[PDB]
Amino acid sequence: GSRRYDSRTTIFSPEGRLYQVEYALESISHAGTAIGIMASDGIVLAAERKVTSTLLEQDTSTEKLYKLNDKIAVAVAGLTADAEILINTARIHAQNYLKTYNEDIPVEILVRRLSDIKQGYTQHGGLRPFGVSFIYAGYDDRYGYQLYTSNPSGNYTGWKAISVGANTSAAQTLLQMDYKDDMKVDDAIELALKTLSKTTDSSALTYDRLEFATIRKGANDGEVYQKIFKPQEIKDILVKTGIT
Amino acid sequence: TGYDLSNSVFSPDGRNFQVEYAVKAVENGTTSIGIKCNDGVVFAVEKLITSKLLVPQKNVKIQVVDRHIGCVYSGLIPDGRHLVNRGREEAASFKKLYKTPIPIPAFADRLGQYVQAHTLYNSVRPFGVSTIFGGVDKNGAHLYMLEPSGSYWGYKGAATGKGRQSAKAELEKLVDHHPEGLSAREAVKQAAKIIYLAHEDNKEKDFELEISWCSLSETNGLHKFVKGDLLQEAIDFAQKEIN
Amino acid sequence: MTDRYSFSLTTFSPSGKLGQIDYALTAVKQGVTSLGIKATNGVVIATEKKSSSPLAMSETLSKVSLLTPDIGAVYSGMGPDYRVLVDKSRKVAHTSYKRIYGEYPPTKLLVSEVAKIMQEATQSGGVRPFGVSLLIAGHDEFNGFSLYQVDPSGSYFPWKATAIGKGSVAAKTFLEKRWNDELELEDAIHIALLTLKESVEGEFNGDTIELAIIGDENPDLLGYTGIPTDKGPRFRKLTSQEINDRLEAL
Amino acid sequence: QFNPYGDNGGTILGIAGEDFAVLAGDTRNITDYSINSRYEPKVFDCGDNIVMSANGFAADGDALVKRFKNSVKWYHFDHNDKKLSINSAARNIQHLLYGKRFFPYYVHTII
Amino acid sequence: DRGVSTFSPEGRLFQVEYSLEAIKLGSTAIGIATKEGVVLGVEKRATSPLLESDSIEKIVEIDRHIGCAMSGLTADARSMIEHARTAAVTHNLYYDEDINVESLTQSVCDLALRFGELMSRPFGVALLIAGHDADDGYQLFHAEPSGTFYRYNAKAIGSGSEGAQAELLNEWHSSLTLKEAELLVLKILKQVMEEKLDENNAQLSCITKQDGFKIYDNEKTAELIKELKEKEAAE
Amino acid sequence: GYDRALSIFSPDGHIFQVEYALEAVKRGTCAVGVKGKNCVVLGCERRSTLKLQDTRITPSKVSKIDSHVVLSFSGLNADSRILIEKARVEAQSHRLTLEDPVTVEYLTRYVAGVQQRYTQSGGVRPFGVSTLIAGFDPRDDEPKLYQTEPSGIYSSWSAQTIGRNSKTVREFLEKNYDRKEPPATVEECVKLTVRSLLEVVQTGAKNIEITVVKPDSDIVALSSEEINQYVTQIEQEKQE
Amino acid sequence: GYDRHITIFSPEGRLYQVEYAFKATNQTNINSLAVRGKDCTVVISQKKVPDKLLDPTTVSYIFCISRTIGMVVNGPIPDARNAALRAKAEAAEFRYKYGYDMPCDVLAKRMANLSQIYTQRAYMRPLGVILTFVSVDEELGPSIYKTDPAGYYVGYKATATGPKQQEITTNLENHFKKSKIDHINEESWEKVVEFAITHMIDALGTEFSKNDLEVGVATKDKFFTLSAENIEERLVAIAEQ
Amino acid sequence: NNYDGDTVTFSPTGRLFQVEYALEAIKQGSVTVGLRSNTHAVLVALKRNADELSSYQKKIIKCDEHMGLSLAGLAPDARVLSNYLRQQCNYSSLVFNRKLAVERAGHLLCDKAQKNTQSYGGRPYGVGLLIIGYDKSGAHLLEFQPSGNVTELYGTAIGARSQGAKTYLERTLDTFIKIDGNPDELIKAGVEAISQSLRDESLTVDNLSIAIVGKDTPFTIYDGEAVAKYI
Amino acid sequence: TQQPIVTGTSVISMKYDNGVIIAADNLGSYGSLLRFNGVERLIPVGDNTVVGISGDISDMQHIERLLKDLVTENAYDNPLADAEEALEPSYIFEYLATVMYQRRSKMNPLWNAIIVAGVQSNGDQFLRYVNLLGVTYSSPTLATGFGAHMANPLLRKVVDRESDIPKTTVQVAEEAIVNAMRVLYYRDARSSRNFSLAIIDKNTGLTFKKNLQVENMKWDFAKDIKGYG
Ligand SMILES: [Cl-]
Ligand SMILES: [Mg+2]
């Protein structure tokens, strides 16, 4: 019957590894690099679009950075379509929590939920896992500014600075060298761009190949603003930091 | 290769090898025949006597559907029974909704579609039987034969099982020598002969003859078994023709 | 019976490739060339009507399809897969949007819904991916004119202009030289016809070319008068004659 | 409106002696002011030296007795032909009756 | 691959036969039936000295009149015990009586072949079910993952079974006392065990009509081990 | 639904998927449990391959199941969350119906039962997780420490370790832990637990986590500096 | 090599099971032809009764789907009858839901969509048949729409299907190149059947008796099949000029 | 070979190997004999023990007051099929106040076994059954094979070494069919028949299992000292 | 739950020495309207059973189709369908009784009162009643509806207890039934003159009489009756 054709996507190897999770991670290593850096007064999310064209409409394009609610955003590395399925689930989960408790969802609770969904695809159902890694940048009034990552295994961890996608080994070494705890957002912007500029497989880092976003308490008084940077605003921050 | 390991897989020829393998089970079975006569149909079958311990006349092979349709088959006997059970459900639902008993061509397609459905998926096995069936309806007598593929046609005469080539030749003679037609009583006699002649392919063990018929004049369009004096008369006629 | 294929038929290979998606893209590569160009005041989508037999009436086969009054689609790859996607895309525009908000979806969100359907054929049990790439052109009040490509994986990208299928690599180079941000719709149609001539072997006329625009509102195609705010569809398929007129000024 | 119950009349009587027991019942079956039958047995031998009667609505009574007789049969199959003791039969009947707690068998039962 | 419910060319179910191999790897369990009671005994087999051995529960109560000992993948036994306890109690609810030991065993064994593509595989554990009822007296059954159960006057399962069963062949007679049976289990366990037998790495239990199913204290078993040592040194 | 039997027997009587789940446990960071006379301590390894981590928000290795019981683990992190959630739900369900918090044995038995179920259910793989469950039963001052594994077997331990290089730290505990006289104080128990991890860990900096559980829902996690003082005192005595 | 057993993509972007279903199409060794008149649509098909024991009246690959729609099949009879029953059901359901007779081209699309599903879903195999639907549609007039195992369909001026389709196709192509019109300019359906038979004779190079052919005719508001004697009258008229 | 992985696959010669492998489980099972006259029908079954401490596995199961069977092969499958027969016999009694005909009981067993041979996931039954009964058309004996094939017979045997008992019955056919109104002589003939299949071992008091059903005889099983009379 | 619409009135029956007799009129009433004058309410099953039905006619026609299907089903794989394994009255009754009780227990009854009359294999007379509630009973005489109140008293004067059955001939029994049918025509407002009568005898088999009429009616005394006081 049908058993003949079943790949068995949810089994252990003899070494105790999940084949499909490992191979999904291999897929993600070829995706554009995404970086998250957390500062005292905010969080930066930077990400490199993959080998673009001059005929791609950039100002209406979004492949890397997505808004989950007013306080939480994600950077994507992997299959964009897979990410959008999860993103829409996460957006609903945030709204379900808001409806129930009349408070914005804490960042970790949203991350745990999405990570649990990913975990399920590794343990049951016989389906392939999602080929997506997320960087979550968010704020709540318990822990303040938070950076997390999740990967196809459904495991998640918290970070002061982190990369996903291509050249994470090289990127994580550069971040580990220049990152300090008393760092500010403007410095973290510069660090994120300098790291991408050195790790990129492209010849030079330009505005048309980048997506950029900040989460600042640079919002008038006791509140948090999300800024998804426009193409012209990425061009300006590249000149300001001295990369172009 | 590997195209013959799973049902419903087209080979590079455009063939379903699993259906063709089911035909081999049919060819391995005992001989069964059908003859279309002037106002009805006659069915007959070869039953191999494996042992003296078999109770004579008890292990009945021919099956009635509704009250007007006979069914006989060669191959895997349980598969035939399963198909007849379905046929009985189909004939029951038809009569429930439409009042009239199911017409024979209508009934033929019901079996045909069901057998064909068992060539569409790898989760099921094809039927290991060719089924000869028919009876009398409002438009007269009808004889059908249905294969493992789901294929069926109407017949003047039909035969399947191990002695089918022998039987087919004998049936073809009857068609040529009787263009005007054959009477029901004649067809019972001829059916006996053809099974006896087809028994040369299964000559090791002796056998038991079993005949049934539906005729407008002789059975009022109902399916009945040939019994007693009329069965013995047909055996005597058959035994006289082989000697 | 029962569908006993409850498991994925698209899986990651050791190298991180999703085999079935790659193979679907190969099927798209073999397909006939289609393109899209965006102007300041419109969008054009075009493809060759590769007729399988001259006895076939190629007008009865529509490669360029209306999805909503302001959104159109064309494809390269497996035609039957496209046809069912158009049916599903038309329906999802109503069920998940018009029946809720009382208006047709914007181009980017309908694309998003089509993408979702294509993604699910890449992960759900007992199915293969769709063997098509779509080019979806459309207009909506707040986003203006737009053009999107959708691949077998479910990934989608916006384009100023692009081409998919057989001679896409050569066609995209041709479009890069001709495209600017000051093109009027007629200029974009002219460029579309020039680009498409390169990939066509045989006859090149209004009967062998299928071309549609997303442009001005067509009140003449609405079917009724009396409501000032309803001004008609922006999707219009060009006629055989309308194509041939622009082939003389070529 | 349809009334699923009825009253078939009748009277039954059980008396336990020192080493015996009797279960008696009249043989008259009725509806309203009519006699249906002058001899319709109401007390039944159910096997294992147990006698039973379910008096009231005769349809429900016949149903219950039939199901209990069946319960004795399956007790034998499931427990190596063990004799069903009277106390065990009594507990088994409670569950048969309570299984229809929200649409009861309209009868008074005596074994 | 191949079906889970597949027959071998010899007419055996592959998965059932393989589960029997898992039971051979399990720790030894012995049962002996007498007219004075049925004794059940097990090898605990702690993997490390830091493991608190009294938490090793390989002898288990099903009802007051039925005990059970296990050998093999003992985690698989938990749902079997749960079902047995439920069946015993449920029958008492329905019939105001104790359930027959055979009927209880049969109910457990009905689970065994409910696997396919229900649970995904057979149980990897064998059970010795011991008990008393009024009809057939003191009984000992051996419940397998095949769904088959045999009654036994005495039986050993687990890694030392064929050596123990040969010893039970010689030693069992129809006049054995309960005390004689307790020593006999201890003797045969001591024979087949890797480590030296004491009150912390072996456990005794019994079922009598009067007192029902009892797991023996470590102090009580310790005395019976000392009684065994002396009577073997006596000749 | 997906029904495929992933956990099955092999000709030699082994269930490979359960055994390969144990190999995932072997890969996981080391976890250790030691019970004193009036406490239980849970030690856990943190691999220092990951710096630039935010330790405030990163999932901690020891999880409270109720106010009186804790659970640590070795193996797949994502898998452990599913067991922790189920255990937490069952803990509140038990309070709701029995009007008493779970015993440590009951909670262990429940978690182990879940692990077992995933070894003979269609369409599912076993949990790649072994757990150490520790605490005190309600109104009881006797310490409790249990272990579970992917197969679903469970048992009680005076002291136990699981995960990578657990063979080494079990070796240490087997010679250093006396049953007749367990660590009488919190200090002695924490010291022996840190000592056992120092056989395997690398640096004694942010690589050791310690959680002390005392009777009557008294659970506290030690900080970096508090643990660093134990690390300092151990090596100064060792220089001799 | 399990990409050849089920309907998943091969490395070349191909569906081998679909391709092999196309090969099953010619297993009957029967050729069909369809043409359009002014007022009618005619479909002819070869009839072969190899066994003398067969009842020749029951041997048929032309089906009456609805009152207006007819269907000829090229492929094995079980799959043919499968498609037929379904098409009949779909046509009846359409009329019930939408209050008018299902158009030929809409039924073709529906059956084509069903065929598409078998090329995408693994558990269902394709049917090894090519379905040629014919009618005189109330909006579009004389109509020929043909469906295949890939889920492809299109309208036709005329068409041919079978082992020798190419010979018939080119014969028809050459005729329509001369006349420069999309149909047979003829008043009566009788003469359109005579055209269809004549051009099949020319293309195949074989003569036909009354029992060697099978004919279906679609007019306004009915589709019907010709008897052997109706065909005989047709053959007599051909031979007399 | 390549065609024995599951029950849904015919071999190139039209064989169903999983069914044939299930048939093999019967041949490994212990011998059991069935025979009948016009008045009575008898089952005789050689029970098998695991060892000298173990009991002898029961071979005969009662289905109704007028019907029952003996088994050879997988005993749990016999329990499943006999339970199904018990239910069908019972349905016939409760609904139609009618004792289920033995022939119709065979037909039901055939159809139940068939469904397991044509569907994916399942497996064939691994047991053969000899059903005896007395109904409105007198005494009956049936032989069930898990292929689905059910056969009505005067006498038969199944299990290991069953060919010896089957040959004996084939010789004795004319004698034992005439044993009317004498239950003891019919059992004697069954015990003498099963003796032709013994090697090394002989019929002891806890080895032998006999059942009988007849004209004024409910289906009853004899074990232990109740069969010492026939040893 | 429904209400009966088109209805059939009394069915009456009794035992006699060698068999049973059953009868019922040929009317289908639509309330007070005597709508359908050619309705057969005695339905034979084989040559040994007659099922007489009163109450809702649509439900009767359903039961008629169930019995027709029961004969068909019994003949399947049954070489003795016309002999030892033919349908018995007791089988046909029990089946109906099961259905009637099941249908009342789903609160969707077949709105009928049924009498199954026949002769068994061993020659024993069979006569038993079942209704919409699943209530069953047997008696030497049985009747439904008005018949219960008027026919039974007359029929019980012939066969009062079991011991009167061997003493009652078929001539005496038929006479009693025909007189009862006349009494019901005098006194039941929903009855008709035309009726059917069936005899099932252990020797002479099943005799089915159609188009019988109530005759020898006394009306002459009406001419003398004047006013109301
Ligand atoms: Cl559709
Ligand atoms: Mg398919």
Numbering used by the authors:
A (entry chain B): 1 to 244
B (entry chain F): 2 to 244
C (entry chain A): 1 to 250
D (entry chain L): 1 to 111
E (entry chain D): 1 to 117, 125 to 242
F (entry chain C): 1 to 240
G (entry chain G): 2 to 242
H (entry chain E): 3 to 233
Q: How did the manuscript describe this experimental structure?
A:
The CP is composed of two identical outer α‐rings and two identical inner β‐rings with total 28 subunits that are arranged in α1‐7β1‐7β1‐7α1‐7 form.
However, the electron density maps reveal that 3−5 covalently bind to the β2 and β5 active site Thr‐1Oγ and develop hydrogen bonding interactions with the oxyanion hole Gly47 N (residue numbers are allocated on the basis of the alignment to the β‐subunit of Thermoplasma acidophilum). These prearrangements facilitate the Michael‐type 1,4‐reaction of the Thr‐1Oγ to the double bond of the GLNPs, located at C4 in the 12‐membered ring system. In addition, the P1‐alanine side chain forms strong hydrophobic interactions with β5‐Met45 and the P3‐threonine moiety is hydrogen bonded to Asp114 and Ser118 of the adjacent β6 subunit. While all these interactions are uniform in each of the bound GLNPs, differences between 3−5 are found in their individual aliphatic tails. Comparison of all three complex structures may explain the distinct ligand binding affinities to the ChTL active site: The aliphatic tail of 3 is engaged in hydrophobic interactions with Pro94, Tyr‐5 and Tyr96 forming a hydrophobic pocket in the β6 subunit. Interestingly, this rigid conformation of the tail region is similar to that of 2 (cepafungin I, CepI).
